[PDB]
């Protein structure tokens, strides 16, 4: 097994200085990243230790140092694994591009700190996921890119600790990724002016649909048992929104779009679905929060009710796309 204990052990008995073997890697890069990554860890250190204390009681700086310190060992530990499990597949032994990439380290390190921080977490003014990102100045999306690869590069993750990151990943896809001023957008555009960039965004999308849909399903089955042919006409609207009217997701939540897609489609077909029940049902989904349909971005930093979002934005934006379903 992979007991929370087993991990705490490997971490404690782990080095605070990169492995001699993990250095062989540095020394095989077109440009040696040692001083580069090393200076990073140090700089980040203060930034973390402090933006940590200024959020947790007082007098307890020891724990701070400890958490980062430990976070760091996990950090290197992974990277090596993450590098070995990269020499093999995709034979090469170099790796300059990656090891010199600020965001890479910035994300890997984050994830560790999130995992370290979350196992010694029973004690601890709460730093559950969302936190760490705003401390390291790390963007949700980017953090998301390292999650899958991270879980696979450490077999000593407890079955729980893993679900914790899976949740994180799931949260970035439903909203965080799409936060105002997040590369997710600026990235998407660029893919519509020069396709075939890399399996990544198109992959992200893939994982998104996998998510959204299933919820869309859950609801469509309950609130729409009769005539199911709609389940697919909503999804289409949905995708279309994500694909062509993505901007509509800016500072909004997947679920928010799903619902509006539900309503608007049932509305051009003249169907018994009242937003009342749609939102009613939405609460039963294993995560949803009333906050999701009560507070919805509208104009500037002004939030109102999903309904308002609908009549003042949704309905108005992809109006034309819907009218051709009546």
């Amino acid at each position: 097994m992979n007991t929370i204990q087993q991990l705490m052990m490997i971490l404690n008995s782990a080095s605070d200085q990169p492995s001699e073997n993990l250095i062989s890697y540095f020394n095989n890069c077109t440009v040696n990243p040692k001083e580069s990554i090393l200076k990073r860890v140090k700089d980040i250190g203060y930034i973390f230790k402090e933006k940590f204390a200024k959020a947790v009681g007082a007098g307890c700086v020891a724990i701070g140092s400890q958490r980062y310190k430990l976070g760091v060992r996990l950090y290197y530990r992974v990277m090596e694994s993450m590098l070995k499990s990269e020499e093999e597949r995709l034979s090469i032994q170099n790796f300059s591009k990656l090891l010199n990439d600020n965001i890479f380290h910035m994300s890997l390190l984050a994830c560790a700190l999130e995992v370290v921080m979350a196992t010694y977490s029973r004690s601890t003014t709460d730093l559950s996921f969302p936190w760490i990102l705003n401390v390291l100045n790390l963007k949700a999306f980017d953090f998301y890119k390292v999650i899958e690869s991270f879980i696979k590069a450490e077999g000593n993750l407890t079955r729980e600790m893993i679900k914790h990151l899976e949740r994180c990943e799931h949260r970035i896809m439903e909203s965080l990724a799409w936060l105002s001023d997040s590369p997710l957008f600026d990235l998407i555009k660029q893919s519509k002016l020069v396709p075939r960039g890399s399996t990544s965004l198109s992959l992200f999308y893939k994982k998104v649909y996998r998510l959204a849909y299933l919820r869309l399903n859950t609801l469509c089955e309950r609130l729409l048992s009769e005539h199911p042919e709609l389940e697919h006409i909503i999804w289409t609207l949905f995708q279309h929104t994500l694909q062509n009217e993505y901007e509509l997701m800016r500072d909004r939540h997947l679920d928010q779009i799903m619902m509006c897609s539900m309503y608007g489609i049932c509305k051009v077909k003249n169907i018994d679905l009242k937003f009342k029940i749609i939102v009613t049902a939405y609460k039963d989904l294993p995560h949803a929060v009333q906050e999701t349909f009560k507070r919805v971005l509208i104009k500037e930093e002004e939030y109102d009710s999903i309904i308002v979002f609908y009549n003042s934005v949704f309905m108005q934006r992809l109006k034309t796309n819907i009218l051709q379903y009546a």
Partner: protein, 114 residues
């Protein structure tokens, strides 16, 4: 009076067959089609539509209401406004912007059961 004359005169430009005549709903399903197909860019029905409307409404009238002596099915459709002057797009937009609008209000709040 001239009702039976307008009859064919309307079923005509509506593109429907006089054998599904007094069926207002099925006539509406049509009338609306002729709208989702009108373009003051392909068509100059600006006059041949002004009639397409006027007549149809004069036939819907005989049903959209609930009578003091309450017999006959209940209407509840929407409202095809007399299309007099308002520019076709401002009209056609208006109409849909409605059959697509949510006139509800959120619900009260939490529970109280156990």
């Amino acid at each position: 009076s001239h009702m039976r004359e307008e009859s064919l005169q309307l079923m005509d430009l509506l593109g429907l067959e006089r054998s599904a005549w007094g069926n207002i709903p099925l006539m509406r399903k049509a009338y609306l089609k002729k709208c989702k197909e009108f373009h003051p860019d392909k068509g100059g029905d600006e006059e041949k539509m002004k009639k397409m409307n006027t007549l149809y409404k004069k036939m819907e009238d005989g049903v959209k209401y609930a009578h003091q002596p309450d017999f006959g099915g209940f209407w509840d459709a929407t409202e095809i406004p007399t299309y007099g002057t308002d520019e076709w797009e401002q009209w056609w937009n208006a109409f849909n912007e409605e059959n697509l609008f949510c006139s509800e209000e959120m619900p009260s709040s939490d529970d109280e059961a156990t």
